């Protein structure tokens, strides 16, 4: 049982590694793109106000 649990902990490193890469991709690509989306929406609100 301890050996089986050791393998589970050892294999768990893969999920943590891909999670870090997934989070890194979101910060580098998704977040800046969403900022551009919000800016365009902000301008549209002013035009609708006009």
């Amino acid at each position: 049982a301890t050996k089986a649990e050791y393998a589970l902990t050892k294999l768990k490193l893969s999920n943590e590694s891909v999670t870090y890469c997934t989070a890194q991709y979101n910060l580098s690509s998704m977040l800046p793109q969403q900022l551009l989306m919000l800016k365009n929406q902000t301008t549209q609100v002013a035009e609708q106000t006009k």
Binding site: Q44, E47, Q48, K50
Partner: protein, 50 residues
Amino acid sequence: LTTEQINMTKEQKEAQRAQTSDTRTDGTRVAGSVGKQKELYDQQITSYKR
């Protein structure tokens, strides 16, 4: 597209202003289709009197 609708709203306002008023928002006399239509009435009014 919202910016383009600004001009259409202004122009449709002038069509509404053609009634109950002989001058546009800027103050110039209306001369378009409605202006020509009014002139026809003036000739017809004189024609009936004549």
